[PDB]
From TrEMBL, chain A:
Residue pairs linked by disulfide bridges in the UniProt entry: C101-C164, C203-C259
Domain Ig-like: 185-271
Superkingdom, taxonomy of origin: Eukaryota
Family: Belongs to the MHC class I family.
Gene source species: Homo sapiens (Human)
Localization, UniProt: Cell membrane; Membrane
Covered residues, full protein: 25 to 300 of 337
Tagged with keyword Disulfide bond: yes
Membrane topology: Single-pass membrane protein; Single-pass type I membrane protein
GO biological process assignments: antigen processing and presentation of peptide antigen via MHC class I
GO CC annotation: early endosome membrane; ER to Golgi transport vesicle membrane; Golgi membrane; lumenal side of endoplasmic reticulum membrane; MHC class I protein complex; phagocytic vesicle membrane; recycling endosome membrane
Record protein name field: MHC class I antigen
Keywords: Disulfide bond, Glycoprotein, Immunity, Membrane, MHC I, Phosphoprotein, Signal, Transmembrane, Transmembrane helix
Chief location bin: membrane
Length: 276, 100, 9
């Protein structure tokens, strides 16, 4: 049903006067489609999905111009933030910016976002109304006063409610075969005898898209979190995702336990039970 | 300055079958800052031809990367992922377990 | 597509 377009910018200063490194990646849902990397030779926005390669030279020329403009702002922002936090040039520092839009089933606007981080913590964020700002600390209050007086929220709002949604719809139709799919998880359970006294049940979900999934354990139909382990959802490298959930159980009590899988691609949520 | 140490998973793209071509993945996530060294090992030796994804980051600002290489598992060959980061006083080695 | 207008912090 619902969809998102998100861009992720990472700008890292070098010790001393070295040029910073600027990285940009774009996603539709869990599917990467563009990259920029100032360390690479091209100095161009580059395609990273087959369906974006159909866009002509005007598209690539435009995205390259814009991403270089973003890098020049981030270059100055690294300098300003060293000033606001009284830091020397000798240390490497990071700015991050994430922005984009979500649409529902009707492919109409649902929400926009723009968030900015310095050295791995919040710095400033646009609130959900796309009209006002959250400053994380006293330095960010300067940025907030500046961006309010300049009506920066109005400019972002026009992009997030307008451009961002119009292009997400174009990408969804042009990349339909890859972006409008759900790959249901391939599921199975394993059993490993840790000792004579305990066994590990491991519930597996493989080859699914999109990445959003819930794996839970139950014992006699009640939630079980004690003696369970859940790994982070991980990319397969082929456009699909993987995840597992394990529970350590007393030998002879395996049949009390069920694994539960929820995913957009499943007709119905799955219940797995260890079968000898 | 907030720093975060990487999480590491080592796994195959497809279910491992001895003598069937596959991909060996090392997924590093949850770390900050972005500079990280990732080697894939075969019997303790660094594998020279390894590729990785474009840097991206999560809702908590922490970075993630996939490192990967084409490989043909056998019964006896051991694989591992070796990670260094400013948060680690020495490199962390996670072995590939077929069933993880 | 990305945006063009990026006011410094
Ligand atoms: Na280190």
């Amino acid at each position: 049903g619902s969809h998102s377009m998100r861009y992720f910018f990472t700008s890292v200063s070098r010790p001393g006067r070295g040029e910073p490194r600027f990285i940009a990646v774009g996603y539709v849902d869990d599917t990467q489609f563009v990259r920029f990397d100032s360390d690479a030779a091209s100095q161009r926005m580059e395609p990273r999905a087959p369906w974006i390669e159909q866009e002509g030279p005007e598209y690539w020329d435009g995205e390259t111009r814009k991403v270089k403009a973003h890098s020049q702002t981030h270059r100055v922002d690294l300098g300003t933030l060293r000033g606001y936090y009284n830091q020397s040039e000798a240390g490497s520092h990071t700015v991050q910016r994430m922005y984009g839009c979500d649409v529902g089933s009707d492919w109409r606007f649902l929400r926009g976002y723009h968030q900015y981080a310095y050295d791995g913590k919040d710095y400033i964020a646009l609130k959900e109304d796309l009209r006002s700002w959250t400053a994380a600390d006293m330095a960010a209050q300067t940025t907030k006063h500046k961006w309010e007086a300049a009506h920066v929220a109005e400019q972002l709002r026009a992009y997030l409610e307008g451009t961002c949604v119009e292009w997400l719809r174009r990408y969804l139709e042009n990349g339909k075969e890859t972006l409008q799919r759900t790959d249901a998880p391939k599921t199975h359970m394993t059993h490993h005898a840790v000792s004579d006294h305990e066994a590990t049940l491991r519930c597996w979900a493989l080859s699914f898209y999109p990445a959003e999934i819930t794996l839970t354990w139950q014992r006699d139909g009640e939630d079980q979190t004690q003696d369970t382990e859940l790994v982070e959802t991980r990319p397969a490298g082929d456009g699909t995702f993987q995840k597992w959930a394990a529970v350590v159980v007393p030998s002879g009590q395996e049949q009390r336990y069920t694994c539960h899988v929820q995913h957009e691609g499943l007709p119905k949520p799955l219940t797995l039970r260890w079968e000898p | 300055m907030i720093q975060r140490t990487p999480k590491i998973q080592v796994y195959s793209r497809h279910p491992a079958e001895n003598g069937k071509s596959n991909f060996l993945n090392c997924y590093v996530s949850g770390f900050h800052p972005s500079d990280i060294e990732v080697d894939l090992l075969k019997n303790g030796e660094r594998i020279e031809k390894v590729e990785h994804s474009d840097l991206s980051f999560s809702k908590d600002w922490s970075f993630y990367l996939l490192y990967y290489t084409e490989f043909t598992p056998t019964e006896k060959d051991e694989y591992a992922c070796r990670v260094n980061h400013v948060t680690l006083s020495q490199p962390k080695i996670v072995k590939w377990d077929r069933d993880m | 597509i990305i945006g063009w207008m990026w006011i410094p912090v």
